[PDB]
From a paper:
A remarkable number of SARS‐CoV‐2 variants and other as yet unmonitored lineages harbor amino‐acid substitutions with the potential to modulate the interface between the spike receptor‐binding domain (RBD) and its receptor ACE2. The naturally occurring Q498Y substitution, which is present in currently circulating SARS‐CoV‐2 variants, has drawn the attention of several investigations.
To accurately characterize the binding kinetics of the RBD Q498Y–ACE2 interaction, biolayer interferometry analyses were performed.
Numbering used by the authors:
A (entry chain E): 339 to 360, 366 to 519
B (entry chain A): 19 to 615
The structure:
């Protein structure tokens, strides 16, 4: 009730892990996405697990498709990658009522450039300037030198594909 | 490492930053256009200046990536759109002067008046004072005064400026490796580096000139029939073998003969198909209209409007406290925001206009998934062509019967059909020789084929021969009559209005073909036809990411503009005109004029 109802979520590039281990979740019907890749939701509540981790962040509506194994793009390659053998669930719901203000909420950020793709469950919060040209940047922006992080602009009038969505990813140890 | 990869990265940065700044400008421009206040107009200018400054800065950075070293064409296109030099390539002295001319010419047209000789205090502007006369006066001398006094007072001011305007523009085009400023303008149809879709700049001349030849018969018989009917309204002044007096054509220039319907209506005593009464009698509102419009596009397989549209669009006049701008606009703010601004009223013209503007949204929505720089019509003609065909189908009594605005007991007699078809031709085919001739003049002026001491001569030589219109008062080179039109003094291309028309009817034939339409092309309704919707969608989704030739070919199956669909639309009128002209000369003589006597 404090990882789902938190009045602010983390930026996708700096996603927050919080260990949930301590059905009614899945019978809420207020979740826009509940896609599991290990076992059916009604089952895991009666299954054997030792560690349950909740990785939570906010992304665009169009980008929720990327929170899944095998996906590619900006969010998958550069922010939060799920492994092919992922055993867990992915939950998302529309957060326009909370994470979008009339002036425009630029608080949430994401990583736009990176030299290489993130490995599964890797996190990168480095603000080191991306070098796109042969000449090195030496820590200043300019021609062929871009600050890697970029800001999400969420307005209450934005389209659904551009509205903010709160995402929670459950990871299970799945002992054997 | 490669320049293409660098350009790929630069555009990736652009597309994300541009989408935001544009959406900021879009929100501010919206607030002003819906609530005209000193606060909202100051925000609109700041947001615009930010978007503009960003655009100029990106354009300068974009040139640092030479497109001579880029192969990915959808990238080469985006870079091409950014690094447009324009007047940057001119000297800073000349650039300063060219902009001074442009802003001077604009303000002469907009803030220039002429006072009538009878009362020196009641002075009239083109809008609304002079345009009201040209669109409602039946007096030969009143019309003559307004037509002449505008071209003599305001026009002569613009003559020395337009002469300077031609020189500086041509230096700007030769520096940009074009041949003349008209060649620069024809670039908006160019396509290079695609097998079988290349379209040279000089090709646009050949096509327009050859496609116009096939309109000449229909225009002559229309022109004959109008000069006939005008001889009844203005008895003594028109000759049945001569051109038409320019000040008698319904507007200030004879661009549209739309206003001549009251005098040229074939069967005047039959009513017009106007379901305005029928809508009010069923208590329709703007909501019901846009629902039916939304319902129309869904019937062919297109999505219904997003909930943002229904929640944010201005669909009525917001009272009298706050003032909007009811000029029907269809907004593509970005970030998935789509809106129609319209002070809708329960009429038929608005019902049609709603289908027209929603078609603009449909086009805007279908390419929204394209990169930012490629969210636009395939060319300058495509967007209005799409919006117009949505009013063609919606207007037919077939469609009006489908939705209950017309009783299934309707009489579609040949007479009201021709009444409507004549009304159409006055606007649609009337402007086609006008638009052609006006651009062809500029095309020879920019190329140097018309010396400065023959501007006004060659102007009326072609107004006589091509348009069939003659000046009521002779004009030497102290005049500049083409500059008396908005699109010429305000530096805008004009051939877009010719192509937009031909494109419009190309789409409508191909869609009504896929829709298995039986009878003539002018009674067609593409509603409930998913084959037509798909055939249209495969062009809308493209935006301007592929050559306009291919985008056109996705609808009609051919890679080039064509006019025979337009003629096919008007062919029932063509025969009726041919029959009513048996007792009248068809064609004109370029020698009769009212002033020479
Ligand atoms: C069924 C359920 O879990 N409801 C909770 C509610 O108890 C809580 O107060 C709120 C956050 O304040 O989030 C939701
Ligand atoms: C053009 C056409 O046939 N439109 C039909 C309409 O007549 C009919 O009332 C409606 C419901 O059946 O489906 C649609
Ligand atoms: C150009 O780059 C885009 C980048 O997304 C790619 O999708 C496209 O296939 C490229 N075009 C080529 C290689 O012809
Ligand atoms: Cl975020
Ligand atoms: Zn329009």
């Amino acid at each position: 009730g404090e990882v789902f109802n938190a009045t602010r979520f983390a930026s996708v590039y700096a996603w927050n892990r919080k260990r949930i281990s301590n059905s009614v979740l899945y019978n809420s019907a207020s979740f826009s996405t509940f896609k599991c890749y290990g076992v059916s939701p009604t089952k895991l509540n009666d299954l054997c697990f030792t560690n349950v981790y909740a990785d939570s962040f906010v992304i665009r509506g169009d980008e929720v498709r990327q929170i899944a194994p095998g996906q590619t793009g900006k969010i998958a390659d550069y922010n939060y990658k799920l492994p092919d053998d992922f055993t867990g669930c992915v939950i998302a719901w529309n957060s326009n009522n909370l994470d979008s203000k009339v002036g425009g909420n630029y608080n949430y950020l994401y990583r736009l450039f990176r030299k290489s793709n993130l490995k599964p469950f890797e996190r990168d919060i480095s603000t080191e300037i991306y070098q796109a040209g042969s000449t090195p940047c030496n820590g200043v922006e300019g021609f062929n030198c871009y600050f890697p992080l970029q800001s999400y602009g969420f307005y209450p009038t934005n389209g659904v594909g551009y509205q903010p969505y709160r995402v929670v990813v459950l990871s299970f140890e799945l002992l054997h | 490492s490669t320049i293409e990869e660098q350009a790929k990265t630069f555009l990736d940065k652009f597309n994300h930053e541009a989408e935001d700044l544009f959406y900021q400008s879009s929100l501010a421009s919206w607030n002003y256009n819906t609530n005209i206040t000193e606060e909202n107009v100051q925000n609109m200018n700041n947001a615009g200046d930010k978007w503009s400054a960003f655009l100029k800065e990106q354009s300068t950075l974009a040139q640092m990536y030479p497109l001579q070293e880029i192969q990915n064409l959808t990238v080469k296109l985006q870079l091409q759109a950014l690094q447009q030099n324009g007047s940057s390539v001119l000297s800073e002295d000349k650039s300063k002067r060219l902009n001074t001319i442009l802003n001077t010419m604009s303000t002469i047209y907009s803030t220039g008046k002429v006072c009538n000789p009878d009362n020196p205090q009641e002075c009239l502007l083109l809008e609304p004072g002079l345009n009201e006369i040209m669109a409602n006066s039946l007096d030969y001398n009143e019309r003559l005064w307004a037509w002449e006094s505008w071209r003599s007072e305001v026009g002569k001011q613009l003559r020395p400026l337009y002469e300077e305007y031609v020189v500086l523009k041509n230096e700007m085009a030769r520096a940009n490796h074009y041949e003349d400023y008209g060649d620069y303008w024809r670039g908006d149809y160019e396509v290079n580096g695609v097998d079988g879709y290349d379209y040279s700049r000089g090709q646009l001349i050949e096509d327009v000139e050859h496609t116009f030849e096939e309109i000449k018969p229909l225009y002559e018989h229309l022109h004959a029939y109008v000069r006939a009917k005008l001889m009844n309204a203005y008895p003594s002044y028109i000759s049945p073998i001569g051109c038409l007096p320019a000040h008698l054509l319904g507007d200030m220039w004879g661009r549209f003969w739309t206003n001549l319907y009251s005098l040229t209506v074939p069967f005047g005593q039959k009513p017009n198909i106007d379901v305005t009464d029928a809508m009010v009698d069923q208590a329709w509102d703007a909501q019901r209209i846009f629902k039916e419009a939304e319902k129309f596009f869904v019937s062919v397989g297109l999505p219904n409007m997003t909930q943002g549209f229904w929640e944010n669009s201005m669909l009525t006049d917001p009272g009298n406290v706050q003032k909007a701008v009811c000029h029907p606009t269809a907004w593509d703010l970005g970030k998935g925001d789509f809106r129609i601004l319209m002070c809708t009223k329960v009429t038929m013209d608005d019902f049609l206009t709603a289908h027209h503007e929603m078609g603009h949204i449909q086009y805007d929505m279908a390419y929204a998934a394209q990169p930012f720089l490629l969210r636009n019509g395939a060319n300058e003609g495509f967007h209005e062509a799409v919006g117009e065909i949505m009013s063609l189908s919606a207007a037919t009594p077939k469609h009006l019967k489908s939705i209950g605005l017309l009783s299934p007991d309707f009489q579609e007699d040949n007479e009201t059909e021709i009444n409507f078809l004549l009304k159409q031709a006055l606007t649609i085919v009337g402007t086609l020789p006008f638009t052609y001739m006006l651009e062809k003049w500029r095309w020879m002026v920019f190329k140097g084929e018309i010396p400065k001491d023959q501007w006004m001569k060659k102007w009326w030589e072609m107004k006589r021969e091509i348009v069939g219109v003659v000046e009521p008062v002779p004009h030497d080179e102290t005049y500049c009559d083409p500059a008396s039109l908005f699109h010429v003094s305000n530096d805008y291309s004009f051939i877009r209005y010719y192509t937009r028309t031909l494109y419009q009817f190309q789409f409508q034939e191909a869609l009504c073909q896929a829709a298995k339409h039986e009878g003539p092309l002018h009674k067609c309704d593409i509603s409930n036809s998913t084959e037509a919707g798909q055939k249209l969608f495969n062009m809308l989704r493209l935006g301007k990411s592929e050559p306009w030739t291919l985008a056109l070919e996705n609808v009609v199956g051919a890679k080039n503009m064509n006019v025979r669909p337009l003629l096919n639309y008007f062919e029932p009128l063509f025969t009726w005109l041919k029959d009513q002209n048996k007792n009248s000369f068809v064609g004109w003589s370029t020698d009769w004029s009212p002033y020479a006597d």
